[PDB]
Amino acid sequence: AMEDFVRQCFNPMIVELAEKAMKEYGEDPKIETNKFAAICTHLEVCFMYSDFGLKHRFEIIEGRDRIMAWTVVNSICNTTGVEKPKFLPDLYDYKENRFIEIGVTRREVHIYYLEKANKIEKTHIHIFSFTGEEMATKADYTLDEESRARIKTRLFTIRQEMASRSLWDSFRQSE
Ligand SMILES: CCc1ccccc1-c1cc(=O)c(O)c(C(=O)O)[nH]1
Ligand SMILES: [Mn+2]
Ligand SMILES: [Mn+2]
């Protein structure tokens, strides 16, 4: 089952967070399994991305309840002067001095890029596929190659584990 795989392939903190995220908004991870899998996969990227950092470079925003995430965002604007977003993003960059929206997609990276860019407004956008393909505003990929390489391998691995269990098709197609 998709669901089994999620518990079997993600650190509980991430599963627990993804469950909480879904079940609060009234979604069943036992039914909406592929969303469950996707939500986990996103958090993890986000956490990975965050913790590949000026010792501490990134502010993690995804993961937090909405009260916290907006505190962290309101705190950040007051002290740096960068514009407040209309939509909570995934990260802030304390070096390059901008918020980051992380996209993960099982479609072409340029398509999921444009969707993102459409929704927003001075947020750096960085998209990862599961084919180890990326795309980021002004092709500024924000991170040293070794860090970007770990994400791509992870996402690829998650693709390939799904495919062991005949899941990739379900998942690829439900975006
Ligand atoms: C996490 C995947 C997802 C599925 C359905 C609706 C929204 C989202 C989503 C995608 C994102 O990239 C993202 O940053 C968020 C978010 O809540 O911040 N949500
Ligand atoms: Mn987000
Ligand atoms: Mn995101």
Curated annotation (Swiss-Prot):
Post-translational modification remark: Phosphorylated on serines and threonines by host kinases, including human casein kinase II.
Binding residue positions for Mn(2+) 2: 62, 90
Effect of residue 39 to T: RO-7 resistant, reduced affinity for Baloxavir and Baloxavir marboxil
Cellular localisation: Host cytoplasm; Host nucleus
Location of the active site: 116
Binding site for Mn(2+) 1: 42, 62, 90, 101-102
Documented effect of changing residue 24 to K: Reduced affinity for Baloxavir and Baloxavir marboxil
Subunit text: Influenza RNA polymerase is composed of three subunits: PB1, PB2 and PA. Interacts (via C-terminus) with PB1 (via N-terminus).
Family of the protein in this entry: Belongs to the influenza viruses PA family.
Function: Plays an essential role in viral RNA transcription and replication by forming the heterotrimeric polymerase complex together with PB1 and PB2 subunits. The complex transcribes viral mRNAs by using a unique mechanism called cap-snatching. It consists in the hijacking and cleavage of host capped pre-mRNAs. These short capped RNAs are then used as primers for viral mRNAs. The PB2 subunit is responsible for the binding of the 5' cap of cellular pre-mRNAs which are subsequently cleaved after 10-13 nucleotides by the PA subunit that carries the endonuclease activity.
Name under which the protein is recorded: Polymerase acidic protein
UniProt source species: Influenza A virus (strain swl A/California/04/2009 H1N1)
